[PDB]
Amino acid sequence: STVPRLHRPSLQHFREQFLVPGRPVILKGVADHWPCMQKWSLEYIQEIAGCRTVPVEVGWSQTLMTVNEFISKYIVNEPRDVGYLAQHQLFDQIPELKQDISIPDYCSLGDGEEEEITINAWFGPQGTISPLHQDPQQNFLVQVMGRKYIRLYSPQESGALYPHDTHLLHNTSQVDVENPDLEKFPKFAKAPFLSCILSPGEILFIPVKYWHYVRALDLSFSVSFWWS
Numbered sequence: 001s002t003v004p005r006l007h008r009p010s011l012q013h014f015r016e017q018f019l020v021p022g023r024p025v026i027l028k029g030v031a032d033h034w035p036c037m038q039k040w041s042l043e044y045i046q047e048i049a050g051c052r053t054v055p056v057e058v059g060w061s062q063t064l065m066t067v068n069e070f071i072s073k074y075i076v077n078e079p080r081d082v083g084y085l086a087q088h089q090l091f092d093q094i095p096e097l098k099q100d101i102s103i104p105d106y107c108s109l110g111d112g113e114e115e116e117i118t119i120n121a122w123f124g125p126q127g128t129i130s131p132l133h134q135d136p137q138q139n140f141l142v143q144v145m146g147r148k149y150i151r152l153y154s155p156q157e158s159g160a161l162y163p164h165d166t167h168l169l170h171n172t173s174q175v176d177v178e179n180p181d182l183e184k185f186p187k188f189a190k191a192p193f194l195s196c197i198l199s200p201g202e203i204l205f206i207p208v209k210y211w212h213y214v215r216a217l218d219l220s221f222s223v224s225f226w227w228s
């Protein structure tokens with residue numbers, strides 16, 4: 001079913017009806033006028049960040065290149081393969097860019113320190129996929145450029161999601177959400193879920209340990225805030 005959308009909810013309402021019970025929600029009217037929303041574009045990103053080295057996930061492999069190289073090879077014209085500038089603390093690397101975002105006010109409802117919030121960039125072409133997985137903190141995923149299809153499964157459904165059998169990968173599902181092998185993973189079929197298309201200016205709250213799967217529908221840039 002579709003993740004609910006709420007316009008600038010009060011801190012207390014967000015706390016009591018979403019944060020405490022661990023229910024996903026899309027926050028509207030919160031990040032829609034952050035400077036990033038109008039400023040970020042390929043040319044702006046090239047100008048500020050183009051010369052800096054970033055990690056890039058290819059496919060599968062992990063490599064390093066400049067932001068300019070990443071754009072040239074994996075976004076513009078006709079890329080040969082899928083590349084994704086994923087899960088990278090770009091704003092620690094480039095303080096000038098950090099000026100264009102801010103910490104959502106709702107994070108102050110947490111028990112953690114603002115200092116310790118981890119801010120990651122997620123920048124890539126249409127078609128990037130983050131396989132179904134869960135993270136150990138709360139998340140606000142802020143969509144800046146393009147749209148993403150997102151599937152969400154509650155931590156209560158973990159037994160239908162066939163986590164990998166190693167410590168290192170136990171927070172990742174073995175299932176390919178959009179083409180599941182139901183012969184091998186039959187329990188996946190019956191597990192309920194939420195989904196949405198997250199659009200520019202919107203924030204998705206992903207509760208701590210909620211399983212999420214994400215596919216970019218367009219050239220996309222998202223910023224996540226992992227907080228407690």
Ligand SMILES: O=C(O)CCC(=O)C(=O)O
Nearest residue numbers: 122130135141214222224
């Ligand atoms: O946007 C994506 O591809 C994945 C984002 C994600 O997993 C996160 O913010 O924790």
Ligand SMILES: [Co+2]
Nearest residue numbers: 133134135212
């Ligand atoms: Co995640």
